[PDB]
């Protein structure tokens, strides 16, 4: 189960930004597989009060990118997108619901996700003008505060976009690096997560960080996709990080 | 979004099992109504060396439930049942914003629910041999060791059973008293959780309390009626409830 996220450095005001592009089983970064290249074909973005301007894949793993200029204080977002793919789908096989699941009507899934990661740039940076504006993602974690100014116990709103509009009733989770050390080498086990909770009618949630740390949070929505006579079904897998104390 | 848990007080060895059954909002006991009655027709459960016993419903309010005799040093089970109700679904047009709607047709769901808490009467009580056998409710939690022996950021194995066999890919969740405090009435819904994963192949998952305190682990699950001729539908909540720390 691959999952896109995003992690950024600890950077100082006057520095290049560096940040890694978060493609398997957090929080380990891996190389994106050659066959798999053609999914990440648009760079990973830096938004700022100038807007968004794209990155530069440089380092010795084909997951770091930098920024073009260096930065100056402030707080900003760091986006990356896994590309729209096509993929068929069946179904069957559950508990005791029943063997024939409409005997193999096989359908057509697009799989989209997307990672955005607040960077805290000062040591004393704790701006909202920009982190809190969406970037337009299908599926998006939009901060309502800034981490920097939330401790242990508190509480981090959060709201969920999808196509643009508050997504309600949508479950949200969050982890930390830390909290599940197990394998991947135990099937496709995917993190357990320290934090769950549901978004009311706004699509807001408040996040409560039970332990200081790196923190991804994530929502799902699998819904219709738009244009019935192209594909069927569409799902969305949006994670956001950021940094707890 | 009424659901069922057990409340036990601190036993010690001599003394009679004081449970409370709670119907509603974790952890807020309240007395079950006039007309849920019938719902709860049945006394709460101590489960012992000896097996299952009914415990007697004595107290100031309907959901206060006294064990039969005074209990030894042990560790042992307290169950709770909402008995089978049948109720009319039709999703007729409801409740937004991902897949088109409608496939109007109004069927039949039956809805049961589960709760079993584990009580350790005594100080150094961490037996295992009862609270790790099944008891045989519809969808359970079978914890796979003692709460007592659990400490802070540890892993305390259980296992989802449904009809009597492992349950996988199951989303089991995990809060505790007092994570999470507001909200009198207003749209009344589902508290945050501090911990969410689901289960494996062989139905097991790792709690991983990161608070000491009173906790809850809870498990949804809706499947087909058996018997399609008399129903369509059925939907489970099965609930765990133990100390930590």
């Known amino acids: 189960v691959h999952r896109v996220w995003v992690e950024t450095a600890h950077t100082h005001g006057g520095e290049y930004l560096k940040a890694d592009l978060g493609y398997g089983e957090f929080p380990e970064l891996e190389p994106i597989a050659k066959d798999r290249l053609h999914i990440f074909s648009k760079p990973m973005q830096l938004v700022t009060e100038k807007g968004k301007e794209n990155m530069i894949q440089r380092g010795t793993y084909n997951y770091q990118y930098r920024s073009n200029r260096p930065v100056k204080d402030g707080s900003y977002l760091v986006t990356a997108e896994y590309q729209p793919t ?51 993602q299908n599926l998006e974690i939009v901060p309502l505060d800034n981490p920097a100014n939330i401790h242990v116990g508190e509480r981090f709103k959060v709201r969920v976009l999808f196509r643009g509009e508050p997504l309600p009733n949508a479950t949200v989770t969050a982890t930390f690096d830390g909290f599940d050390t197990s394998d991947r080498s135990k099937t496709h086990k995917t993190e357990a997560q320290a934090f769950s909770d549901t978004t009311d009618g706004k699509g807001e949630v408040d996040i409560i960080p039970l332990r200081q740390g790196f923190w991804k949070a994530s929502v799902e929505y699998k819904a219709d996709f738009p244009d019935q006579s192209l594909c069927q079904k569409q799902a969305n897998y949006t994670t956001l990080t950021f940094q707890i104390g």
Not at 114 to 121: D, Q, S, Y
Request: hydrophobic share 35%.
């Open 86 to 136: 096509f993929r068929s789908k069946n179904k069957a096989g559950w508990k005791q619901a029943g063997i024939k699941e409409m005997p193999d009507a096989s359908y057509c899934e697009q799989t989209r996700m997307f990672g955005k990661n607040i960077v805290n740039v000062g040591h004393e940076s704790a701006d909202t003008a920009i982190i809190t504006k969406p970037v337009g």
